[model samples]
Target: NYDPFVRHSVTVKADRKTAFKTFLEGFPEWWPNNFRTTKVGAPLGVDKKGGRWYEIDEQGEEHTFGLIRKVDEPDTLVIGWRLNGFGRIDPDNSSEFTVTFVADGQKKTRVDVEHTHFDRMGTKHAKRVRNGMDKGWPTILQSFQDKIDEEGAKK
Candidate 1:
């Protein structure tokens, strides 16, 4: 059967609480600078329902990635991604991206990210996007891990 999700994992040196905090609070600090939708603005983040995952341009125009679907603090977070290739939010063309932070040890945490619901975009497009993310998530996760390590070192 064809699936519409891509999963990637990374082990952070910090404990669950620390890792989760760093990931949420320090999101702007480590998100790949080039991953932004605009050339200037705050980094991506989701804190509550209807919260925007967006960036603002130099002109103060907001480029939103999506809205927050759910948040379970230090555990799970889900975003309703609606941004399309042409740069617009189309509710009919939306997907969900979820992340979970699991404690693996007293001083370690395993972060799992799943980008799903791609079928919402249609089978061919879903496959294409999923393939792209399958190749991209690892690099992004590594960058995220590096940030967690950096934050841990500062503590």
Candidate 2:
């Protein structure tokens, strides 16, 4: 049987609306460059439910990330994670990321993340990914919070 992959949370210094927009629409800005597959690209953006989400290389080839599984703007978003260890898009070995935003206090929002379905990658691979994400998610969340603050400061 498979186990829960990982969970991470972060409190941002922005309201739920701003935080959600920054998380979804502003993904390319905060996403670590290490995650970027191509040197030249456009912003990684997602549309509503059933919409596509991916990045493109300078060659015009689409490096599809995943489908937007669910989107409840300013509150929740669930997306497919389609890449493999080598960063190739693999539908069969995919996972799901569900993120929820809650208003914590004045001008503050709590973002909760749940990344599941590691079992799809088989036992050994799943464990490896789980361990990697355990260390990675927190840093990713902090990066996101930093972006939120940077943008907030600019406004």
Candidate 3:
């Protein structure tokens, strides 16, 4: 048995709406280069709800890794991450990723990423993945700031 709920809490130093929009609308821009959450060379990865997120091979074949289960605008995002590499493929095995953003101020936002409903991932794997997201989210969010700062300074 593994821990059912794994949480990654991060407080970003940016406006809540900015952080939220960046996470959703700016996903294709900031996500790590190695991660292909959608078709390869698609120009943009995520768009709309219910879109399938996959990795594309060199031959243009796609391997679906997850889906955008829910999108609640600039506040919450829920994605269903298929444990395709979780070793065993049992009918009962499943997982999900839930991200919530809370507005702290005009220039601060608290983000809580909760990945839950794992059939057997436990804490170790969960923490490892959580840490990855923790490290990635900041860089991603900072990319958002960089864009805004560039625009604001130009104006």
TM of each candidate vs. truth:
0.65, 0.68, 0.57
Candidate 2, residues 1-155, lDDT tens digits: the string is 23535576786877776876665666555555445645423565454446777565576646555677766667777776653455534437567678787886657777777764553454666555556454664476567678777777436
State each candidate's clash count.
Answer: 0, 0, 0
Model 3, span 94-151: residue lDDT tens:
4677888788646666777775456356566566445445555446545555565453
- List RMSD in Å for every model shown: 4.5, 4.4, 5.6
Tens digit of lDDT per residue, candidate 1, span 1-155? 12544566787878887776665555545555445545533554434445556564666646555677777676887766542344534446566667787886577778777764563345665555455454554577677677777777545
Arranged by lDDT, best first: 2, 1, 3
Per-candidate Cα lDDT values, in order, are 0.61, 0.62, 0.57
Clashing pairs in 3: none
Q: Report the candidate with higher TM-score, 1 versus 2.
A: 2
Residue 29 Cα positional deviation in candidate 3, in Å, after optimal superposition? 2.5
Q: After superposition, how far is residue 147 of candidate 1 from its true place, in Å?
A: 3.1
| lDDT winner between candidates 1 and 2 | 2
